[PDB]
Amino acid sequence: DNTTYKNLQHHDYSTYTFLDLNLDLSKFRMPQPSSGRESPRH
Amino acid sequence: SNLIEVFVDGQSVMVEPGTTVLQACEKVGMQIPRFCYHERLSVAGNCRMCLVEIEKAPKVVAACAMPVMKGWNILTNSEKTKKAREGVMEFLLANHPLDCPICDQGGECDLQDQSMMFGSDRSRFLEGKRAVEDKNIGPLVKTIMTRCIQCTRCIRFASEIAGVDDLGTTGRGNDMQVGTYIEKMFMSELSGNIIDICPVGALTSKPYAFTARPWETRKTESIDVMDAVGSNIVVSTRTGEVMRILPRMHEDINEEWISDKTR
Amino acid sequence: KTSFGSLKDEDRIFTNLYGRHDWRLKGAQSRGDWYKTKEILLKGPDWILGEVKTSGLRGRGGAGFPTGLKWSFMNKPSDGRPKYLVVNADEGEPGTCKDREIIRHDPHKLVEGCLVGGRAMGARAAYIYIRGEFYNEASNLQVAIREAYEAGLIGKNACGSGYDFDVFVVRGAGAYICGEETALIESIEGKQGKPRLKPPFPADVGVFGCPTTVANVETVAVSPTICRRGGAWFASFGRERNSGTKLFNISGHVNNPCTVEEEMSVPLKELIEKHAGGVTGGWDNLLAVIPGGSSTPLIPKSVCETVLMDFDALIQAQTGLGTAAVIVMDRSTDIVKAIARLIEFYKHESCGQCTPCREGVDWMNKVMARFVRGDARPAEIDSLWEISKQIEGHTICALGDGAAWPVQGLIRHFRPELEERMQQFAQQH
Amino acid sequence: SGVNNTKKWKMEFDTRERWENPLMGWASTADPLSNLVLTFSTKEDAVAFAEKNGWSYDVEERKVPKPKSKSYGANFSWNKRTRVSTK
Amino acid sequence: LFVHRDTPENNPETPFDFTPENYKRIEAIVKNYPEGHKAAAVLPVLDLAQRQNGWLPISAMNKVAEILQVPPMRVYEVATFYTMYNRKPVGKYHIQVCTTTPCMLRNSDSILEAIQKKLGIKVGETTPDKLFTLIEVECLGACVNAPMVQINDNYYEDLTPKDIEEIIDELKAGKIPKPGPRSGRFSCEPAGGLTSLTEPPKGPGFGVQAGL
Ligand SMILES: Cc1cc2nc3c(=O)[nH]c(=O)nc-3n(C[C@H](O)[C@H](O)[C@H](O)COP(=O)(O)O)c2cc1C
Ligand code: SF4
Ligand code: SF4
Ligand code: SF4
Ligand code: FES
Ligand code: FES
Ligand SMILES: [K+]
């Protein structure tokens, strides 16, 4: 078919949809690198 | 051995790698005009008054930030360089207030002096000017922020030298403003130094206000006794009266700062 | 070849541009995404960079630098710091909305593009910076990214190739200047979106002070197809040094404003008529066209008759391809007002960091406001021209140039309209 | 920031009393050298001039600002404290 | 204004805290960035506070500065630089009409005029019932669907004065109108029938170069 819009999932997205996905992805991420200090002011 | 050769108006000069174009020029006695650059602060590169032509390069470079490359010929007085300075000076003065008679910086103002030496002699700005509300930051530093040219020297000094991150820029574009956002006093033992580094009369000494003009004061080079550091100072006097205290550069002591008590 | 256009569907890259097929992983794979990705990664960074080089691909974010050479600045040994790919999805140029379609309808092309482009650079992760207003689009991208992670296509041992690669989505907060590559990096680092001076270059000191490459969404998303189908396949489209296919946004006074994929060097007239339905009120009703987003100078109808849509042809016409956003103005348009509004846009978007744009663009805006009403003298036209030349080439970033060029385009091609407006005002007053 | 007033050597004399004029409050003086300031190309020239005129003197060695090591890229350091938090 | 003056409604003692579920979201946000560079999370975290609260009182800015150990001024700079942050309360629905040239050329003025007449406000104002705030914005990246508006997180596109009044009518009733174009087409494809991508897309491996 080529006559229907198939991007209707975003009609149900809410305020926290983006950050919930980010939280969900948190387990998959590789460990972050480290600059060696807690911040540039340390 | 590591030194590289660069040219300043055809004059050869040997510089360490990493030397900026502005630092190459001062090695032959040329002082590039500047506003945002201070050699004791981090490089900013935002005022654009230091733009200079490099021979064979279509684009002018910011001399204060651009590292000099081997074989470059820096044209500090070419037509392209002069027109770049005139353009930047024109933009700096477009919104600047007609305050020189009432402004304490008058007579020792880098904006006045570099306008005389590197800018045009007239205006073609036909619109109305920006006006900015004043911020109260304590009993020592008076702010007339319509005079501010957004050089960010005070912000960098506060964060880097005084270690206080209370100054910043709020807003965007032409309406970008330097201040604390909230009402807050910038009270630090080094706070008075932002008066010296501010190139304009945006930040001035509250105690000193309106009392003297720079051309009429006599300078006595002396020493501070408010502590045991022995900071080198200049005592401004007029007609037998002490009018203010200014830092005197001594690289091994107070480099060019003094404490608020000394000031 | 000497004629370019009529791109066939089999040669189009963004085959779900209009979102009429499943945009999720299953749909993406049925359309060829994520196919032999493992073989591409194991071919090596040098092979990938060669394929992008031979493709003749140039940046699609507005400036058009050769992509293969740009990405090769990263192809250097490690010095202890991580390496990053930053994908520019800020999509802020007025008239330009192409990257929006890629992100929401072909997200897996972008995700694969990050991995392949990331491999060629040696980068450990990709940060996709997407403008805050694109909330629904960013959420679509996050869903696609999660599918890739679950399928093992990204992350640890990505595509079973032994290469670890993360993909992070970071949202902007409303600022056109954050599309500028160094301002984008400053924004990711949690600062005001103010561009950095160069040097250093991002390939040396970039995001978090680490080697970085900033690439446009379209530039990244076409890379996996280039590796699959070959650089020579890409270079067979368009003129020499103007290779490939391009996404065009035709907006303004056309009958059917739309986004379409077409061959580079297609005639501008052909693009507007074949795909956009022609200029509103007929071709002869055309006044001026902004060929590549609000930052490129306008060109009059006479120039528009024969001009080709590619980097070199439009530079020869005293303008630029830019983002390939075609804004069409017919003769009913108040051309002076239309340009004045773009100057008002740049005045609102200037970051305020550096003097010529902070003060100059606002100054140009005030002069243009008076030029709209005729409330000026003709001698001010040359003054406005000179002011624009004092901004161009004197600022930290190219936003200053982007505000100067539209003014220059108006004075170059429509000076009589400006002068006529002034005569009318003076007579009335 | 201008450095053009730091090129030449100067010779000034010791400061002496100034008092308020009773009539107007103006600053009076009895020091005939209160305003005298001479300019010299080198410290040697200034020293020579003082010697032949019989003035005892003190010489202060010229203070030069030492060369700094400036680097814009240090504002964005990956792991050093030179990273700036604002621009 | 880009300066702050304490009021009874907006001062450091105004109450703001993140909910326990938002603290978990912050934890995942902060982990997206290298250790030693937590300041990178200021924008997403500051945006998160705006989503919980609707706008950013000075106390919300201070809280974010505390959590990420950045000076408050560096958060004030971010809040005042980026236009999507609301430093004053807005209405339940924030209507943002694009008026840049591409949308101007397709009569965004009519859309802006229709909203004002229906809501009985002017650009920049909030309705007395505090349901709607109206402002003009720059190009929203939906140029080919001009004229268009953003309401909160959603785009409404290909608008006409009647269409935007029916969207506002739905919002008043409490219903949620579906986003996207209102002229018939679904997204950015040309109206009157596709001029490309009519054929089915090729499958996996089509046109792949030999040796790969
Ligand atoms: C004011 C301004 C806005 C820009 N906006 C974008 C943008 O929204 N998207 C983009 O890809 N590039 C934008 N750019 C260009 C980028 O700075 C940079 O050239 C580009 O991301 C490089 O990617 P590319 O080589 O694939 O083209 C902008 C530049 C300027 C000066
Ligand atoms: S800062 Fe300088 S130029 Fe400005 S009013 Fe004061 S003296 Fe005049
Ligand atoms: S107040 Fe003075 S030092 Fe601070 S940014 Fe303005 S001009 Fe520069
Ligand atoms: S040109 Fe404008 S946007 Fe670019 S750095 Fe300068 S002030 Fe900021
Ligand atoms: S002194 Fe170089 S840009 Fe300011
Ligand atoms: S001009 Fe309105 S969305 Fe681009
Ligand atoms: K001062």
mmCIF file with all atom_site columns, N, CA and C in Angstrom, chain B residues 119-158:
data_model
loop_
_atom_site.group_PDB
_atom_site.id
_atom_site.type_symbol
_atom_site.label_atom_id
_atom_site.label_alt_id
_atom_site.label_comp_id
_atom_site.label_asym_id
_atom_site.label_entity_id
_atom_site.label_seq_id
_atom_site.pdbx_PDB_ins_code
_atom_site.Cartn_x
_atom_site.Cartn_y
_atom_site.Cartn_z
_atom_site.occupancy
_atom_site.B_iso_or_equiv
_atom_site.pdbx_formal_charge
_atom_site.auth_seq_id
_atom_site.auth_comp_id
_atom_site.auth_asym_id
_atom_site.auth_atom_id
_atom_site.pdbx_PDB_model_num
ATOM 1   N N  . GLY B 1 119 ? 39.363 54.836 14.401 1.00 0.00 ? 119 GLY B N  1
ATOM 2   C CA . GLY B 1 119 ? 38.012 54.930 13.910 1.00 0.00 ? 119 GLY B CA 1
ATOM 3   C C  . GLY B 1 119 ? 37.830 56.106 12.967 1.00 0.00 ? 119 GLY B C  1
ATOM 4   N N  . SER B 1 120 ? 36.636 56.178 12.397 1.00 0.00 ? 120 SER B N  1
ATOM 5   C CA . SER B 1 120 ? 36.272 57.319 11.579 1.00 0.00 ? 120 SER B CA 1
ATOM 6   C C  . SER B 1 120 ? 36.029 58.531 12.477 1.00 0.00 ? 120 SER B C  1
ATOM 7   N N  . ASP B 1 121 ? 35.757 59.671 11.855 1.00 0.00 ? 121 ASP B N  1
ATOM 8   C CA . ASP B 1 121 ? 35.613 60.927 12.575 1.00 0.00 ? 121 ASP B CA 1
ATOM 9   C C  . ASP B 1 121 ? 34.173 61.421 12.629 1.00 0.00 ? 121 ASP B C  1
ATOM 10  N N  . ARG B 1 122 ? 33.208 60.615 12.201 1.00 0.00 ? 122 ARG B N  1
ATOM 11  C CA . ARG B 1 122 ? 31.820 61.053 12.162 1.00 0.00 ? 122 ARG B CA 1
ATOM 12  C C  . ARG B 1 122 ? 30.910 59.840 12.241 1.00 0.00 ? 122 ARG B C  1
ATOM 13  N N  . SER B 1 123 ? 29.616 60.117 12.341 1.00 0.00 ? 123 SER B N  1
ATOM 14  C CA . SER B 1 123 ? 28.581 59.105 12.461 1.00 0.00 ? 123 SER B CA 1
ATOM 15  C C  . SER B 1 123 ? 27.695 59.108 11.226 1.00 0.00 ? 123 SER B C  1
ATOM 16  N N  . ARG B 1 124 ? 27.243 57.921 10.827 1.00 0.00 ? 124 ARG B N  1
ATOM 17  C CA . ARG B 1 124 ? 26.151 57.783 9.873  1.00 0.00 ? 124 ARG B CA 1
ATOM 18  C C  . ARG B 1 124 ? 25.017 56.950 10.455 1.00 0.00 ? 124 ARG B C  1
ATOM 19  N N  . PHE B 1 125 ? 25.003 56.775 11.773 1.00 0.00 ? 125 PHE B N  1
ATOM 20  C CA . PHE B 1 125 ? 23.929 56.074 12.460 1.00 0.00 ? 125 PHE B CA 1
ATOM 21  C C  . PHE B 1 125 ? 22.756 57.028 12.639 1.00 0.00 ? 125 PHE B C  1
ATOM 22  N N  . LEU B 1 126 ? 21.630 56.722 11.999 1.00 0.00 ? 126 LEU B N  1
ATOM 23  C CA . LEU B 1 126 ? 20.487 57.623 11.971 1.00 0.00 ? 126 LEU B CA 1
ATOM 24  C C  . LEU B 1 126 ? 19.303 57.124 12.793 1.00 0.00 ? 126 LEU B C  1
ATOM 25  N N  . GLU B 1 127 ? 19.462 56.047 13.551 1.00 0.00 ? 127 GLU B N  1
ATOM 26  C CA . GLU B 1 127 ? 18.366 55.468 14.309 1.00 0.00 ? 127 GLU B CA 1
ATOM 27  C C  . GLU B 1 127 ? 18.430 55.936 15.760 1.00 0.00 ? 127 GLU B C  1
ATOM 28  N N  . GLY B 1 128 ? 17.571 55.363 16.598 1.00 0.00 ? 128 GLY B N  1
ATOM 29  C CA . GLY B 1 128 ? 17.660 55.567 18.026 1.00 0.00 ? 128 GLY B CA 1
ATOM 30  C C  . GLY B 1 128 ? 18.508 54.507 18.697 1.00 0.00 ? 128 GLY B C  1
ATOM 31  N N  . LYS B 1 129 ? 18.977 54.814 19.900 1.00 0.00 ? 129 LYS B N  1
ATOM 32  C CA . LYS B 1 129 ? 19.962 53.986 20.578 1.00 0.00 ? 129 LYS B CA 1
ATOM 33  C C  . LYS B 1 129 ? 19.326 53.082 21.623 1.00 0.00 ? 129 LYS B C  1
ATOM 34  N N  . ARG B 1 130 ? 20.004 51.973 21.885 1.00 0.00 ? 130 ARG B N  1
ATOM 35  C CA . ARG B 1 130 ? 19.666 51.107 23.003 1.00 0.00 ? 130 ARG B CA 1
ATOM 36  C C  . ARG B 1 130 ? 19.850 51.851 24.321 1.00 0.00 ? 130 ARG B C  1
ATOM 37  N N  . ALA B 1 131 ? 19.016 51.507 25.295 1.00 0.00 ? 131 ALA B N  1
ATOM 38  C CA . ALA B 1 131 ? 19.186 51.958 26.667 1.00 0.00 ? 131 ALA B CA 1
ATOM 39  C C  . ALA B 1 131 ? 18.942 50.773 27.582 1.00 0.00 ? 131 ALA B C  1
ATOM 40  N N  . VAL B 1 132 ? 19.773 50.650 28.609 1.00 0.00 ? 132 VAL B N  1
ATOM 41  C CA . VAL B 1 132 ? 19.828 49.466 29.454 1.00 0.00 ? 132 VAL B CA 1
ATOM 42  C C  . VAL B 1 132 ? 19.675 49.904 30.901 1.00 0.00 ? 132 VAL B C  1
ATOM 43  N N  . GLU B 1 133 ? 18.945 49.125 31.688 1.00 0.00 ? 133 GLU B N  1
ATOM 44  C CA . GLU B 1 133 ? 18.776 49.470 33.091 1.00 0.00 ? 133 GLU B CA 1
ATOM 45  C C  . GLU B 1 133 ? 20.025 49.121 33.885 1.00 0.00 ? 133 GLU B C  1
ATOM 46  N N  . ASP B 1 134 ? 20.225 49.849 34.975 1.00 0.00 ? 134 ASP B N  1
ATOM 47  C CA . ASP B 1 134 ? 21.415 49.716 35.795 1.00 0.00 ? 134 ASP B CA 1
ATOM 48  C C  . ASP B 1 134 ? 21.234 48.622 36.838 1.00 0.00 ? 134 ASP B C  1
ATOM 49  N N  . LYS B 1 135 ? 22.344 47.988 37.189 1.00 0.00 ? 135 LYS B N  1
ATOM 50  C CA . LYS B 1 135 ? 22.386 46.931 38.185 1.00 0.00 ? 135 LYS B CA 1
ATOM 51  C C  . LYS B 1 135 ? 23.168 47.417 39.397 1.00 0.00 ? 135 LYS B C  1
ATOM 52  N N  . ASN B 1 136 ? 22.660 47.126 40.588 1.00 0.00 ? 136 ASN B N  1
ATOM 53  C CA . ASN B 1 136 ? 23.352 47.456 41.825 1.00 0.00 ? 136 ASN B CA 1
ATOM 54  C C  . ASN B 1 136 ? 24.145 46.238 42.277 1.00 0.00 ? 136 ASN B C  1
ATOM 55  N N  . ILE B 1 137 ? 25.462 46.386 42.369 1.00 0.00 ? 137 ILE B N  1
ATOM 56  C CA . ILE B 1 137 ? 26.344 45.289 42.737 1.00 0.00 ? 137 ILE B CA 1
ATOM 57  C C  . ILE B 1 137 ? 27.201 45.635 43.953 1.00 0.00 ? 137 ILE B C  1
ATOM 58  N N  . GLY B 1 138 ? 26.757 46.581 44.777 1.00 0.00 ? 138 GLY B N  1
ATOM 59  C CA . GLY B 1 138 ? 27.443 46.904 46.005 1.00 0.00 ? 138 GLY B CA 1
ATOM 60  C C  . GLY B 1 138 ? 27.846 48.359 46.095 1.00 0.00 ? 138 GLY B C  1
ATOM 61  N N  . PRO B 1 139 ? 28.461 48.742 47.215 1.00 0.00 ? 139 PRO B N  1
ATOM 62  C CA . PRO B 1 139 ? 28.823 50.147 47.434 1.00 0.00 ? 139 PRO B CA 1
ATOM 63  C C  . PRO B 1 139 ? 30.129 50.580 46.790 1.00 0.00 ? 139 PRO B C  1
ATOM 64  N N  . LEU B 1 140 ? 30.854 49.684 46.130 1.00 0.00 ? 140 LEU B N  1
ATOM 65  C CA . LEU B 1 140 ? 32.163 50.017 45.588 1.00 0.00 ? 140 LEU B CA 1
ATOM 66  C C  . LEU B 1 140 ? 32.149 50.250 44.087 1.00 0.00 ? 140 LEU B C  1
ATOM 67  N N  . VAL B 1 141 ? 31.420 49.438 43.330 1.00 0.00 ? 141 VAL B N  1
ATOM 68  C CA . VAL B 1 141 ? 31.416 49.513 41.876 1.00 0.00 ? 141 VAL B CA 1
ATOM 69  C C  . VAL B 1 141 ? 30.076 50.072 41.425 1.00 0.00 ? 141 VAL B C  1
ATOM 70  N N  . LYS B 1 142 ? 30.110 51.253 40.821 1.00 0.00 ? 142 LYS B N  1
ATOM 71  C CA . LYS B 1 142 ? 28.934 51.835 40.196 1.00 0.00 ? 142 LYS B CA 1
ATOM 72  C C  . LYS B 1 142 ? 28.788 51.300 38.780 1.00 0.00 ? 142 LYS B C  1
ATOM 73  N N  . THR B 1 143 ? 27.559 50.980 38.394 1.00 0.00 ? 143 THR B N  1
ATOM 74  C CA . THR B 1 143 ? 27.276 50.447 37.069 1.00 0.00 ? 143 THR B CA 1
ATOM 75  C C  . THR B 1 143 ? 26.404 51.423 36.295 1.00 0.00 ? 143 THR B C  1
ATOM 76  N N  . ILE B 1 144 ? 26.871 51.813 35.116 1.00 0.00 ? 144 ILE B N  1
ATOM 77  C CA . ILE B 1 144 ? 26.064 52.539 34.146 1.00 0.00 ? 144 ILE B CA 1
ATOM 78  C C  . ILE B 1 144 ? 26.092 51.702 32.879 1.00 0.00 ? 144 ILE B C  1
ATOM 79  N N  . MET B 1 145 ? 25.238 50.689 32.819 1.00 0.00 ? 145 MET B N  1
ATOM 80  C CA . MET B 1 145 ? 25.423 49.589 31.888 1.00 0.00 ? 145 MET B CA 1
ATOM 81  C C  . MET B 1 145 ? 25.038 49.928 30.458 1.00 0.00 ? 145 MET B C  1
ATOM 82  N N  . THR B 1 146 ? 24.407 51.073 30.217 1.00 0.00 ? 146 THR B N  1
ATOM 83  C CA . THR B 1 146 ? 24.228 51.525 28.845 1.00 0.00 ? 146 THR B CA 1
ATOM 84  C C  . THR B 1 146 ? 25.566 51.785 28.169 1.00 0.00 ? 146 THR B C  1
ATOM 85  N N  . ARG B 1 147 ? 26.616 52.045 28.946 1.00 0.00 ? 147 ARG B N  1
ATOM 86  C CA . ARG B 1 147 ? 27.948 52.244 28.395 1.00 0.00 ? 147 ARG B CA 1
ATOM 87  C C  . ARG B 1 147 ? 28.659 50.939 28.072 1.00 0.00 ? 147 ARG B C  1
ATOM 88  N N  . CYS B 1 148 ? 28.173 49.812 28.581 1.00 0.00 ? 148 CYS B N  1
ATOM 89  C CA . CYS B 1 148 ? 28.851 48.536 28.391 1.00 0.00 ? 148 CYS B CA 1
ATOM 90  C C  . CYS B 1 148 ? 28.950 48.181 26.913 1.00 0.00 ? 148 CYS B C  1
ATOM 91  N N  . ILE B 1 149 ? 30.121 47.704 26.503 1.00 0.00 ? 149 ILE B N  1
ATOM 92  C CA . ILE B 1 149 ? 30.345 47.251 25.138 1.00 0.00 ? 149 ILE B CA 1
ATOM 93  C C  . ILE B 1 149 ? 30.406 45.734 25.054 1.00 0.00 ? 149 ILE B C  1
ATOM 94  N N  . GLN B 1 150 ? 29.993 45.032 26.108 1.00 0.00 ? 150 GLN B N  1
ATOM 95  C CA . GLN B 1 150 ? 29.844 43.577 26.087 1.00 0.00 ? 150 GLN B CA 1
ATOM 96  C C  . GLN B 1 150 ? 31.160 42.881 25.763 1.00 0.00 ? 150 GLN B C  1
ATOM 97  N N  . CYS B 1 151 ? 32.248 43.386 26.332 1.00 0.00 ? 151 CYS B N  1
ATOM 98  C CA . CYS B 1 151 ? 33.556 42.789 26.120 1.00 0.00 ? 151 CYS B CA 1
ATOM 99  C C  . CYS B 1 151 ? 33.785 41.545 26.973 1.00 0.00 ? 151 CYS B C  1
ATOM 100 N N  . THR B 1 152 ? 33.012 41.368 28.044 1.00 0.00 ? 152 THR B N  1
ATOM 101 C CA . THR B 1 152 ? 33.070 40.228 28.960 1.00 0.00 ? 152 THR B CA 1
ATOM 102 C C  . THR B 1 152 ? 34.378 40.142 29.739 1.00 0.00 ? 152 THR B C  1
ATOM 103 N N  . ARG B 1 153 ? 35.154 41.221 29.812 1.00 0.00 ? 153 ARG B N  1
ATOM 104 C CA . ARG B 1 153 ? 36.343 41.202 30.657 1.00 0.00 ? 153 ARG B CA 1
ATOM 105 C C  . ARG B 1 153 ? 35.974 40.996 32.117 1.00 0.00 ? 153 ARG B C  1
ATOM 106 N N  . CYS B 1 154 ? 34.950 41.703 32.589 1.00 0.00 ? 154 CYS B N  1
ATOM 107 C CA . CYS B 1 154 ? 34.550 41.596 33.984 1.00 0.00 ? 154 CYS B CA 1
ATOM 108 C C  . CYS B 1 154 ? 34.099 40.184 34.315 1.00 0.00 ? 154 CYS B C  1
ATOM 109 N N  . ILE B 1 155 ? 33.361 39.555 33.403 1.00 0.00 ? 155 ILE B N  1
ATOM 110 C CA . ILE B 1 155 ? 32.899 38.190 33.626 1.00 0.00 ? 155 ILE B CA 1
ATOM 111 C C  . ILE B 1 155 ? 34.087 37.251 33.758 1.00 0.00 ? 155 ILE B C  1
ATOM 112 N N  . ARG B 1 156 ? 35.048 37.364 32.841 1.00 0.00 ? 156 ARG B N  1
ATOM 113 C CA . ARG B 1 156 ? 36.212 36.489 32.884 1.00 0.00 ? 156 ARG B CA 1
ATOM 114 C C  . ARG B 1 156 ? 37.072 36.766 34.109 1.00 0.00 ? 156 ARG B C  1
ATOM 115 N N  . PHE B 1 157 ? 37.291 38.037 34.446 1.00 0.00 ? 157 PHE B N  1
ATOM 116 C CA . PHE B 1 157 ? 38.064 38.343 35.644 1.00 0.00 ? 157 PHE B CA 1
ATOM 117 C C  . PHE B 1 157 ? 37.408 37.745 36.877 1.00 0.00 ? 157 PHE B C  1
ATOM 118 N N  . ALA B 1 158 ? 36.095 37.926 37.010 1.00 0.00 ? 158 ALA B N  1
ATOM 119 C CA . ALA B 1 158 ? 35.404 37.443 38.195 1.00 0.00 ? 158 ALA B CA 1
ATOM 120 C C  . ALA B 1 158 ? 35.535 35.935 38.328 1.00 0.00 ? 158 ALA B C  1
#
